[PDB]
Nucleic acid binder design. Structure first.
Length: 178
RNA sequence: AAGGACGAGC
């Protein structure tokens, strides 16, 4: 478990929040190997966000299942840290409840996706996409969860073995565009 | 949406 699999961005922090209270707070779900509140170099004031890193991906998952999170009188806004290498890429920092899944071919059905994806989180809807004219399966689908974190969690692995296929998953982007 | 670490002349 490389650090980017165990690291959370924390947004919406009180400007009073320090590394200490961030650490105290998040250590109820485990050991932290790193913790920072980001500060303005000139004024030394909190920029309103920080990062925490747990020792195991188990602990991140327990923290994020354990939401919402309040610290210093504010509900904060945690999200899995997108790899630095990915900054500047299209949709890198997008936050969405909907997953694109491609490479599922013409034999994959709602239940195949429901079976595979349900232990990541609560699924609201599964859409297996068909041609409007033929009704043939187009080889891709979308899964919509009740929260963004299953999506964020799922896409840290690019390929998923679903119904005998090595499917690629991505954050669902708007049509719209795209 | 990045300070550190990974990797500062160790």
């Amino acid at each position: 478990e490389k650090e980017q699999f165990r690291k959370l961005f924390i947004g919406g922090l009180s400007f009073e929040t320090t590394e200490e209270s961030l650490r105290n707070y998040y250590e109820q779900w485990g050991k932290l190997t790193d913790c920072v509140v980001m500060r303005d170099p000139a004024s030394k004031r909190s920029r309103g966000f920080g990062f925490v890193t747990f020792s195991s991906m188990a602990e991140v998952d327990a923290a994020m299942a354990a939401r919402p999170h309040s610290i210093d009188g504010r509900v904060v806004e945690p999200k899995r840290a997108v790899a630095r290498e990915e900054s500047g890429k299209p949709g890198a920092h997008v936050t969405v409840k909907k997953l694109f899944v491609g490479g599922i071919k013409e034999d994959t059905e709602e239940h195949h996706l429901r079976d595979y994806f349900e232990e990541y989180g609560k699924i609201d809807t599964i859409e297996i996409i068909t041609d409007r004219q033929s009704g043939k399966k187009r080889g891709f689908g979308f899964v919509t969860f009740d929260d963004h974190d299953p999506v964020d969690k799922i896409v840290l692995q690019k390929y998923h073995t679903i119904n005998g296929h090595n499917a690629e998953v991505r954050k669902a982007l708007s049509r719209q565009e795209m």
